[PDB]
């Protein structure tokens, strides 16, 4: 619970940890109490100037939840302390963010820009199809996956969750953006074997 002493810790509310990071960088993180137990904590991490996601933690290996767990569990994986879950979860998450953002499949940086880039890329190519990944603003910690058959077509979107273990979509995690592209291909083939 709120007994953390780490330099990334803040007793701030979820809105306060947000508005704190909204004054920080395109990559930010602060530890704060969880809304679902004393054996639980959270990390609020920032993706863009006004975009953030909460990631709960469980303080495992303690006889009482009033006591600080000898381990910290994140997305179902244990670690020795908050500084381990932060370096592991953040640095792995941030490198996956560099490989996705550097990907040719990744669109622009903010809603307006990506909607302008997908529509512009669709209308300048009104007979070619369009499919790109970008930040999701209604569902942080997930990236949106916009698809159009062409300029004259409707628009469809799906999502991929970001995790320090990779990218998670439909039902499985891919430890790198390249494997996410393989996941998408093996999944569309499993979908084409139905359509």
């Amino acid at each position: 619970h709120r007994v953390i002493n780490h330099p990334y810790y803040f007793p701030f509310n979820g809105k306060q940890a947000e508005d704190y990071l909204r004054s920080k960088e395109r990559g930010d993180f602060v530890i704060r109490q969880s809304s679902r137990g004393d054996d639980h904590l959270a990390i609020t991490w920032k993706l863009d100037k006004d975009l953030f996601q909460h990631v709960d933690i469980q303080e495992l290996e303690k006889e009482n939840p009033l006591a600080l767990g000898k381990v910290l569990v994140v997305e179902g994986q244990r670690y020795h302390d908050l500084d381990q879950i932060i370096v592991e979860y953040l640095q792995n998450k941030i490198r996956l963010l560099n490989e996705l953002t550097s990907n040719e499949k990744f669109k622009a940086g903010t809603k307006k820009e990506v909607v302008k880039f997908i529509e512009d890329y669709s209308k300048v190519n009104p007979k070619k199809s369009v499919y790109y990944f970008s930040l999701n603003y209604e569902n942080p910690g997930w990236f949106y996956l916009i698809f159009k058959l062409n300029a004259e077509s409707k628009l469809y979107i799906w999502n991929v969750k970001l995790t320090h273990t990779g990218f998670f979509l439909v039902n499985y995690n891919y430890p790198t953006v390249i494997q996410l592209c393989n996941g998408f291909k093996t999944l569309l083939k499993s979908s084409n074997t139905r359509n």
Binding site: N139, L145, N159, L188
Partner: peptide, 16 residues
């Protein structure tokens, strides 16, 4: 929002 998974498949709409 922030706690609401949703994602349909790639939808290849073709023999891909």
């Amino acid at each position: 929002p922030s706690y609401s998974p949703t994602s349909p498949s790639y939808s290849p709409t073709s023999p891909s």
